Structures are given as C-alpha cells and as structure tokens.
Amino acid sequence: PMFTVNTNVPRASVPEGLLSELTQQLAQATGKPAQYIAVHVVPDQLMTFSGSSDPCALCSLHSIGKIGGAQNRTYSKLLCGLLADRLHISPDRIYINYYDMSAANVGWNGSTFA
Amino acid sequence: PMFTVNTNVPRASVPEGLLSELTQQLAQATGKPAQYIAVHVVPDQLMTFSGSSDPCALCSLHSIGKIGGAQNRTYSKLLCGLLADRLHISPDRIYINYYDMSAANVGWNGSTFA
Amino acid sequence: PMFTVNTNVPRASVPEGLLSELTQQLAQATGKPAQYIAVHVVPDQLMTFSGSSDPCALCSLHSIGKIGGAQNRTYSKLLCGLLADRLHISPDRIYINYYDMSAANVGWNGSTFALE
C-alpha cells in the first residue's frame, strides 16, 4: 500500500515521525506487512478547500486489495482522525481517494505483483 | 471535485487569485458548492512535455460522477483555456486526466460519501 | 503518456538530462511518439518505504493503451533498472503504478484525445 498526503500545513508543523506512525497504523489497519507500505507527505502546498487557504489535505491510498466500501469507511475514520489531530486540519477539509490496484498494474523490484 | 495542476511555471507566475477563480469555475461546471471543491497548484516543477522544458502542465480532475467523454470536452475547453491564459502555457502542452470516483472510494469528514 | 517519479533523493542527485532519457525510453518501450510524452520528476520528498527513509521512489505511468500484464512487466524491468542506476535507489524500494486511460478521459489542447 502507498499513502500520500498533500497539505498546505507547513513542514515545521509536520511531526517528525509522522511517516513512521502512518506506516505502523496503515500496517495495522490494512493487515498488509509494513515491508510493503510506502508513505509520502508533501507539506507547504498551495491548495484550497472551499476557496480558502485554511489547513486542508488531499490524500490517496493505493492498495492491491484491502480496499472497498466498508473498509474505506474505517480507513477514513482512522486517517481523517489521525491527520486532523496530528496536522490540526478540520476533517471536513480532508479528502482521501482510495484506489484498488490490480496486481498486474503495480511494478516493484523490476517486475509486477501479478 | 478535486482539481490538481502540476506545472514548471514558477510560483510568481501563479496569480494569488487563481485558486479562488478555479473554485468558482469548477462550481459552475459541476454545480457543486465550494465546500466540496478542492484545488491544488504545484508550480516550479521539474517537467518535460514532448522532450522539452517549455511551459507545460499536467492536471487531474477527480469527481464523483459528472465525468465522461462529452462532458470532459466541456471541462477541457474551460480549464485548458483558463490555465493557458493565467499561467502563460500553450494549451497543447496541458494534459488533464479525468477520474470518475465511486462515492465509496472518497473519504471526507471521517467517513465516505457512499 | 505521462510518467511521474516522486523520490526522496535530492535534486542534486538527479542527473541532468534524465527527463530526456525517460522521454526517449518511454517512447521506444510504449511505441508512442515522444511528442506526446510528459515526464515529471519530484525530488527532495518526504517519504518512507518499509518504514525507512532510505532512497526510494513512487512512480506512475499513465497511458492511453499500451498497458497490460506483459507490457507492464517489460516497463517495470526497464524503469526500475533505469531509475535504480540513475538515482541510486534499490529496485525493491521503487513502486510504479500503471493506469490505462480512456482517450475520453484525457483532456488536451482544449479538447480530449477522443475528439482529436
């Protein structure tokens, strides 16, 4: 799984160790081994929600399975709560797009997962 | 809806007003209240298009519905035109990828839209 | 096609001309004309892979066709190898997501590729 967070929160407001926390929490939440979890946090972005520059985040979770209606509700409660708390973003200014990737469409280590 | 623009045009070339203007135009094009519209502009990128470093942009519009070939022509005429003019980019060096998201695959406010 | 590379390798570690090289390599591998290929490299990123901040990359290739199980294996061998060598990244710390785009879902020049 790959989790990306783009945010207008500045880098100094991003806790050191957020990427480790996300890695461990995503391992637990998805049941996928930590070895396969990648995280990418992009602070200082020029972004708006509702046309305003108040703190916001646009995120994505890509995974080969472990994605779907009920699971994504759970993920959204976990990850909106964690980002809202850690980055001080209102949860109604966070989107998370979920992507169920086919194993044939993910390259890694010079091959694909198919 | 979520609109993302990645460009090699510098930050000083991005009008302060542009994210508000994009919000207004996307609200007209989609009918959605600003509350649901997110815009993300990423200037100063290392990019090429046709193997050249001339000004370009790579963009995405994610929307729950309201996506398809006919409708995307309307979005493309609107958004290519506006970005070309505001960012001083030739319209033939702008791509916009459209993504029709399932409501179950968009997290917001601690839940999903499903 | 569009190829994006996000990496924690610093900008100084990106060899000059890598985006030209990627353009050429993608052109030959996909059979798409270079004129339609865009490349975006995003260095200095805050990233982890397996919970470690060692060099890694997360990439995407979007293309109208030329995507599929066998093709993607060929692209992955080529692009993992090239990025590993150029950016000094272990191949087991690179993901590449592939996306087969409908022509109707790619806007370009004020229209779409389905209409061009």
Side-chain angles (χ1 to χ4, degrees), chain A, chain B, chain C residues 1-115:
Chain A
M2 306 150 235
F3 186 63
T4 305
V5 183
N6 279 269
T7 183
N8 59 356
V9 170
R11 171 60 160 109
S13 305
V14 174
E16 307 153 33
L18 180 62
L19 285 82
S20 283
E21 183 178 35
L22 285 171
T23 295
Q24 290 313 308
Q25 288 288 318
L26 288 161
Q28 182 58 44
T30 67
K32 289 271 190 177
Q35 172 199 323
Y36 291 112
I37 302 180
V39 185
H40 181 200
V41 176
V42 194
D44 297 294
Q45 298 303 98
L46 174 59
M47 52 173 76
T48 58
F49 222 112
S50 210
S52 97
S53 70
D54 288 348
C56 63
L58 299 171
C59 307
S60 52
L61 180 62
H62 294 81
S63 183
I64 295 161
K66 302 287 186 71
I67 291 289
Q71 290 168 263
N72 292 359
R73 284 194 288 283
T74 300
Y75 294 147
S76 298
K77 181 197 174 86
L78 178 71
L79 297 167
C80 290
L82 186 54
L83 298 172
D85 193 73
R86 309 292 191 263
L87 300 182
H88 294 194
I89 300 172
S90 175
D92 65 2
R93 299 173 66 78
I94 298 172
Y95 279 144
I96 310 175
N97 285 354
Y98 296 96
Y99 305 94
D100 184 5
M101 299 298 294
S102 162
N105 288 333
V106 181
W108 174 66
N109 205 23
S111 189
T112 69
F113 286 95
Chain B
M2 184 179 76
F3 189 61
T4 303
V5 181
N6 296 279
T7 181
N8 53 1
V9 306
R11 174 60 184 268
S13 289
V14 182
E16 188 277 334
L18 178 63
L19 287 80
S20 172
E21 187 175 30
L22 287 165
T23 297
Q24 294 168 339
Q25 293 298 317
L26 289 165
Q28 185 284 148
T30 70
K32 293 282 163 72
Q35 201 185 339
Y36 303 109
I37 302 179
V39 182
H40 183 194
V41 177
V42 192
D44 294 294
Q45 298 301 102
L46 178 53
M47 301 173 78
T48 57
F49 193 121
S50 315
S52 71
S53 290
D54 282 341
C56 62
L58 295 179
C59 313
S60 296
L61 179 61
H62 293 84
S63 181
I64 298 166
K66 315 159 187 313
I67 295 292
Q71 180 63 46
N72 293 354
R73 176 201 170 105
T74 307
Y75 297 141
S76 298
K77 183 187 187 161
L78 183 62
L79 298 167
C80 293
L82 185 56
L83 295 172
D85 288 349
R86 296 290 179 269
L87 300 176
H88 292 57
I89 299 171
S90 175
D92 67 0
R93 297 171 67 76
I94 301 177
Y95 285 153
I96 309 183
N97 284 30
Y98 296 93
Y99 306 95
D100 188 351
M101 297 303 288
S102 163
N105 289 330
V106 182
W108 178 63
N109 203 21
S111 191
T112 70
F113 289 94
Chain C
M2 182 178 338
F3 187 60
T4 302
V5 182
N6 299 283
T7 181
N8 55 358
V9 168
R11 172 58 183 84
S13 297
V14 178
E16 296 301 304
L18 175 64
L19 285 77
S20 294
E21 187 180 24
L22 286 167
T23 296
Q24 283 324 302
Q25 289 294 323
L26 289 163
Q28 61 90 196
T30 66
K32 296 271 185 180
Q35 192 212 322
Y36 297 108
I37 303 176
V39 184
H40 179 198
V41 176
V42 192
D44 298 287
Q45 296 302 103
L46 181 63
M47 307 177 54
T48 58
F49 197 117
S50 312
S52 157
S53 69
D54 282 353
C56 65
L58 300 176
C59 311
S60 293
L61 180 62
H62 295 81
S63 180
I64 300 167
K66 304 293 185 51
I67 294 294
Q71 280 165 300
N72 294 357
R73 282 184 282 279
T74 297
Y75 299 148
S76 298
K77 181 189 173 106
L78 169 67
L79 295 165
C80 292
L82 189 52
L83 298 171
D85 290 348
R86 299 292 180 272
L87 299 180
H88 299 301
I89 298 174
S90 179
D92 67 356
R93 296 180 62 76
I94 298 173
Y95 281 145
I96 307 170
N97 283 12
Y98 298 93
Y99 304 93
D100 185 359
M101 300 299 291
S102 176
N105 288 337
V106 183
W108 175 59
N109 203 19
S111 183
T112 68
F113 278 94
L115 292 157

